[PDB]
Design a protein around this ligand. Structure first.
Ligand code: CA
Ligand code: CU
Ligand code: CU
Ligand code: CU
Ligand code: CU
Length: 289
């Protein structure tokens, strides 16, 4: 436990909120219901997802090798692949818009022919749950619990669909980075961004958190279970004791209503802890006092 650091974090009061899909419109397999009352002690949470600049200081200081560098490849969205054809290990099965690209990792997130020199303030991607919790440890932080993330993401509002309210595009304007157009072939970039956006795009929510909806998925501490909500403690729920996949929240720049609207503040997803991809990052937290 390195010397605790609240740099770039806001302190949120905590208290009691209604966690879950207040509209019963979610995906049944994800267990967004029942809406259940949770009580959180005050905590800190990152204002933004972790940046390339910050994650790079972590690697410079610890020589950490990310799971995507060990496995040898990470998933890249097919429209933005920037690699020699030798490196394309072919479409991922079950979702052919994801190309397994050899050499694709956080420093070269579209493949061997890309860099992140122009994107220090973009969220870091190609980071697994292991890479995420490693960084947090080194940085004097931890990952948020799922409940901490949703409460922080709701921004002091109760029972809303999104971090800012219930209209997806208030005033007919975009305030988050997801997908527009015909997925997976055409992205019209109405929201300003094809792939990742800078961490402080648009505007923060009620608690000061930028881009909890969209941009990239965000690792949480919990194991995923679609029945945790109906069995949850009331105080500081940490998730079930074991599981198959760790929780992801927020959605990403690929989310679209046609197949995955998980940018809803109550939507949930998961993935195996050593998974990485070009739309998956994280933000840290910490206890208070
Ligand atoms: Ca977009
Ligand atoms: Cu390490
Ligand atoms: Cu296409
Ligand atoms: Cu952009
Ligand atoms: Cu989605």
């Amino acid at each position: 436990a390195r010397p605790r650091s609240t740099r770039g974090q806001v302190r949120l009061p905590g208290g009691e909120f209604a966690m879950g899909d207040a509209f019963g419109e979610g995906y049944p397999a994800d267990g967004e219901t029942p809406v259940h009352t949770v009580r959180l002690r005050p905590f800190h949470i990152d204002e933004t997802a972790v940046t390339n600049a910050r994650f790079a200081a972590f690697v410079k200081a610890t020589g950490h090798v990310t799971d995507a560098e060990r496995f040898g490849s990470s998933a890249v969205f097919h429209l933005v692949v920037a690699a020699p054809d030798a490196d394309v290990l072919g479409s991922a099965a079950g979702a052919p818009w994801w190309i397994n690209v050899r050499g694709a990792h956080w420093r070269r997130p579209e493949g061997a022919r890309s860099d992140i020199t122009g994107r220090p303030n973009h969220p870091v991607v190609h980071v697994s749950w292991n890479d995420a919790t490693a960084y947090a440890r080194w940085a004097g932080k931890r990952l948020p619990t799922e409940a901490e993330w949703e409460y922080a993401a709701r921004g002091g509002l109760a029972g809303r669909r999104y971090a800012w309210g219930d209209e997806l595009t208030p005033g007919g304007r975009w305030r988050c980075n997801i997908w527009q157009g015909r997925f997976p072939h055409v992205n019209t970039a109405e929201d300003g961004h094809l792939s990742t956006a800078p961490v402080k795009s648009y505007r923060p929510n009620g608690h000061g958190l930028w881009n909890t909806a969209g941009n990239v998925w965000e690792w949480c501490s919990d194991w995923f279970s679609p029945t945790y909500y109906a069995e949850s403690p009331t105080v500081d729920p940490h998730g079930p004791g074991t599981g198959a996949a760790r929780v992801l929240r927020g959605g990403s720049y690929l989310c679209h209503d046609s197949y995955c609207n998980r940018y809803r503040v109550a939507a949930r997803s998961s993935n195996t802890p050593d998974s990485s991809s070009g739309n998956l990052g994280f933000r840290c937290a910490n206890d208070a006092d």
